[PDB]
C-alpha cells in the first residue's frame, strides 16, 4: 500500500519463516501467498 500504509491481516493468517524464505498462510482461506495478504 504505497499510497495508503494503513492495512493489516485478518484473523487466521500465519507468518512462517523457512530457510527458503517467508510466506503467509491463511487458516480460513487456506491460501498461501508470497506477499502479505489482505482482508
Curated annotation (Swiss-Prot):
Endpoints of the signal sequence: none
Compartment list: Cytoplasm; Nucleus
Native organism: Homo sapiens
Domain WW: from-to ranges: 8-39
Top-level taxonomic group: Eukaryota
Tissue: Expressed in various tissues, highest expression in brain.
The name this protein goes by in its record: Amyloid-beta A4 precursor protein-binding family B member 3
Subunit and interaction comment: Interacts with APP (via intracellular domain). Interacts with APLP1 and APLP2 (via intracellular domain).
Span within the parent record: 30 to 61 of 486
Function: May modulate the internalization of amyloid-beta precursor protein.
Gene behind the chain: APBB3
Amino acid at each position: 500500500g504505497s499510497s495508503g500504509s494503513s492495512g493489516g491481516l485478518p484473523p487466521g493468517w500465519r507468518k512462517i519463516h523457512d530457510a527458503a524464505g517467508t510466506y503467509y498462510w491463511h487458516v480460513p482461506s487456506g491460501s498461501t501467498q508470497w506477499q502479505r495478504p489482505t482482508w
